[PDB]
C-alpha cells in the first residue's frame, strides 16, 4: 500500500493552505506553505493532538506546525520535535524525527500522497494505527 493516492485539487488547498485525507487507512494532514507541500501523520506524536488545527510558524529558520494542545513544534520538512535549551543565549535543539513525514507530489494540478516507509519507527506511529486513547 505504498503508491499515490490523489487527495485532491491543487486549487482546493491553496485557499485554506491545509487539508486532511485518508491515505490507505492512514489519516494525514497536508500543508501548503511558502509554495511547498508537506504531508505528515495527523495526530501529534506527543499525546495525539490535532495537528491540522495548529498554527504554522518559523523557529530557527525552519517552518513548523505547532500542536494546539501542548504547543510542541514539529518541522514541516522533517517531522523533528524542536526546542530551545536554556541555561538559567537560548540554543535550538532536536530529538530526531518524531512525526512521520509522507511524500507529496503535484501533477496536473492534483495533489498525490505516498505513505513513507522511512524512518523505520516514529513516535507518531502509535497514534496513527489501531487501539489508542488521546490525552489533552
Ligand atoms: S499532543 Fe501535541 S503537543 Fe501534546
Curated annotation (Swiss-Prot):
Name of the protein in its database record: Rieske domain-containing protein
Phylogenetic lineage: Eukaryota, Metazoa, Chordata, Craniata, Vertebrata
Alphabetized Pfam families for the sequence: Rieske_4 (PF22543)
Residue ranges annotated for the Rieske domain, each copy included: 3-109, 4-113
Cofactor note: Binds 1 [2Fe-2S] cluster per subunit.
Keyword Signal among UniProt keywords: no
Keywords: 2Fe-2S, Acetylation, Iron, Iron-sulfur, Metal-binding, Phosphoprotein, Repeat
GO MF, one annotated term: metal ion binding
Lineage top rank: taxon: Eukaryota
Residues reported to bind [2Fe-2S] cluster: 44, 46, 67, 70
Listed cofactors: [2Fe-2S] cluster
